Write an enzyme that holds these catalytic residues in place. Sequence first.
Site, PDB file in Angstrom:
ATOM      1  N   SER A  52      -0.673  15.542 -12.081  1.00 37.75           N
ATOM      2  CA  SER A  52      -0.920  15.173 -13.460  1.00 37.75           C
ATOM      3  C   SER A  52      -1.159  16.438 -14.283  1.00 37.75           C
ATOM      4  CB  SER A  52      -2.133  14.237 -13.529  1.00 37.75           C
ATOM      5  OG  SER A  52      -2.528  13.975 -14.864  1.00 37.75           O
ATOM      6  N   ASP A  85       0.829  -1.197   0.000  1.00 37.55           N
ATOM      7  CA  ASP A  85       0.000   0.000   0.000  1.00 37.55           C
ATOM      8  C   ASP A  85       0.868   1.254   0.000  1.00 37.55           C
ATOM      9  OD1 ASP A  85      -1.935   1.907   0.314  1.00 37.55           O
ATOM     10  OD2 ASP A  85      -2.448   1.385   2.388  1.00 37.55           O
TER      11      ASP A  85
END
Length: 330
Positions: free
Chosen positions: A199, A35
């Site tokens: 992004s 994770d």
Amino acid sequence: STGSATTTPIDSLDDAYITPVQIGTPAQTLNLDFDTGSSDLWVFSSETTASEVDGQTIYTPSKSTTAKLLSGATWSISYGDGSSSSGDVYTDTVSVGGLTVTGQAVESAKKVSSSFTEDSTIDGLLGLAFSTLNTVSPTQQKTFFDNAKASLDSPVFTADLGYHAPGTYNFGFIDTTAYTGSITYTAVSTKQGFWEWTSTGYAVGSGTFKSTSIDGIADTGTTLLYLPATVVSAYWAQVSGAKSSSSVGGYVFPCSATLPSFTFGVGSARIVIPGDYIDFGPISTGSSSCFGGIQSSAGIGINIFGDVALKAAFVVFNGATTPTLGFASK
């Protein structure tokens, strides 16, 4: 040193991925959920409340000659999905894919929430976010990666998750045969303890690319892709009959649909998520309403590039003095 381990979807939907991890002496192999959005290595154990164990493999520290109670240490964690666990702490030898860390904090669960109990395939979590998020008190502990880093050939790990197929976590090296083209690296903020990046935009299907900054985290422990409501609406508007269902808890779509791809930007590069990666199947057995793999982050407080996004790429988690993230097509 290096390590390399195969990671395997837990079910036909790729709801999560499990990776075998050796703990203790002799080794006890548990299948952990790696994770990159958390920083605790915790396991089902011989200390876990018996009614809360249902099929998981447990760690028994009393059977490990290298286990030592970390005196006075406790831990307690709550995840973004509302699940939680807590317990005490041992140090022990932990190996992943041939890479060994001695003295790793192994957090032994005394209690786990129902979601964990109900998932027989996940024996615990191995956190790979920054150690500043580790919950051990009163002395915070380091992640497996943080402990291994100085010994690694290069201070990196990579995630290469499969679509409906196994993939690979590598530590200490970049497998140049595992991706196509080049890796595009992008800046990371560690201020919130995550692999947080920005992004450069998105496209829906064959549509034009929208240049827009989207801050979010690279999180292997989250199944879906969670993005701003504007982006998510633009995606689902291209699927006839798709709608946001408050009763179901997100966007659903007719199972008869053909889903468009979704592209996200990494600098000037582009990662394409095929439409089929966005299908999470019937909302309940036999239903013709299917659950979408792109959902709104509104009310999460952060955008999350979970498995839906990451499995479309070869992803480098670069833990150099100034961390960065790399993405390549594959």
